[PDB]
Amino acid sequence: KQVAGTMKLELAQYREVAAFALDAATQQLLSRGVRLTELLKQGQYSPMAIEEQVAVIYAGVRGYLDKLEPSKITKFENAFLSHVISQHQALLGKIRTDGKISEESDAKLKEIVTNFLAGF
């Protein structure tokens, strides 16, 4: 809920304006919406645990992808999952058990996303 209410509002705003392709806010809405659309694609027979969806949409909405090209957003996603599922299983278990993103969990996820994106 925390992660996706923002995405719902942002997608709403993006849809409201996508009928033509000016200012900083408008272009920001277009770019964020395109990133989120690229983020929501998925592959067949590839379901994702709830925590994994939370992590991906978090990295998408809070704004840690606005510089990466939209075409790469899919590839990023893949690689990111590989890292998250490999090293920080403790954080994902914390999210799953306590079905909520606490402030400390939010900070740990933030630093994880920033660090991973650094390697690009």
Binding site: A79, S82, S86, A118, G119
Partner: protein, 154 residues
Amino acid sequence: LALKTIDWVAFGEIIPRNQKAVANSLKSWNETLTSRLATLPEKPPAIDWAYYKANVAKAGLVDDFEKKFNALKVPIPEDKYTAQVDAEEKEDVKSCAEFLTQSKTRIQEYEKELEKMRNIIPFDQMTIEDLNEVFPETKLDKKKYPYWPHRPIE
């Protein structure tokens, strides 16, 4: 089984441009083969030998095959690339000696120049010979332009 950890952000800043794209291809090999590790489980399962045999008519053949399978052990493939350790050492001596000692000596130079330039006598207290010794590049070159004013008027 143990692999060292890499921080690509710093590692990027090390490649000479001449051998750069090859290094990017190497990186690509790395990610491909990292994934192709991650995919397949750690160890192939076994077989329900006794139950299976109960499911077979030619059971003795099943026991024969199981035994021989137990006998065969996959040849342990080998390393041939301590030569990369050789590269470790060679580039070690190369970079260390040349770059890292030319560094110390060149630093000694630039240090002495800085000392000089910090304690240049104030110009008010200074004659033209002083400047010609200080910035030799303002020498009037009394041999290539021996006649006055030794610098073309332009």
